[PDB]
Amino acid sequence: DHILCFSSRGRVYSMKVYQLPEATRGARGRPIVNLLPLEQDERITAILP
DNA sequence: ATAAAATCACCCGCACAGATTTTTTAAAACGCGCCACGGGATTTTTAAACCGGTATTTAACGGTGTATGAATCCCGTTTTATCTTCCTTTCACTTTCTTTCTCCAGT
């Protein structure tokens, strides 16, 4: 499924779910700045499948 | 995949020309000293100027017949102005090594 990510400054980005990193309960994940060209303090606040 | 054409390192002995490397030698220098020489003040002697006069010796002058000085044309020689260059240098970039930070599976 496609997901639309809305940033803290009004931007919209597109991605597919399986491109997200896979991990277990003990892990903490990976930073999202690698996946999307975000700004210095821009953050994601909404996702729409 | 078939044709055309090219290039370099080392080993083994021996003789000699050229390039460092010690080694010896003659010139230049320094310190100390003494006596050979030149300055200063008398005696002595002689070189040259001056009067003669005479007896030569030179230079200026008038004809002939050359040898050379200035001018021209070249070509090897050396100077000077004018190009390219390799090492020194840093320096921003890139790469590569070393330490650290987590993940994380296992018990």
From Swiss-Prot:
Compartments reported by the entry: Cytoplasm
Other information: When the enzyme transiently cleaves DNA a phosphotyrosine bond is formed between GyrA and DNA. In the presence of quinolones this intermediate can be trapped and is used as an indicator of drug toxicity. The enzyme-DNA intermediate is also the target of a number of topoisomerase poisons, including toxin CcdB. Few gyrases are as efficient as E.coli at forming negative supercoils. Not all organisms have 2 type II topoisomerases; in organisms with a single type II topoisomerase this enzyme also has to decatenate newly replicated chromosomes.
Subunit relationships: Heterotetramer, composed of two GyrA and two GyrB chains. In the heterotetramer, GyrA contains the active site tyrosine that forms a transient covalent intermediate with the DNA, while GyrB binds cofactors and catalyzes ATP hydrolysis. Can form a 2:2 complex with toxin CcdB in which GyrA is inactive; rejuvenation of GyrA(2)CcdB(2) is effected by CcdA.
Record remark on domains: An N-terminal fragment (residues 1-523) can be reconstituted with GyrB, but the complex no longer has negative supercoiling or ATP-independent DNA relaxation activities, although it is capable of DNA cleavage; ATP-dependent relaxation is inhibited by novobiocin and non-hydrolyzable ATP analogs. The fragment has ATP-dependent DNA relaxation and 30-fold improved decatenation activities, unlike holoenzyme it preferentially binds supercoiled DNA.
UniProt function note: A type II topoisomerase that negatively supercoils closed circular double-stranded (ds) DNA in an ATP-dependent manner to maintain chromosomes in an underwound state. This makes better substrates for topoisomerase IV (ParC and ParE) which is the main enzyme that unlinks newly replicated chromosomes in E.coli. Gyrase catalyzes the interconversion of other topological isomers of dsDNA rings, including catenanes. Relaxes negatively supercoiled DNA in an ATP-independent manner.
Family per similarity comment: Belongs to the type II topoisomerase GyrA/ParC subunit family.
Protein name, UniProt field: DNA gyrase subunit A
Whole-protein coverage range: 588 to 636 of 875
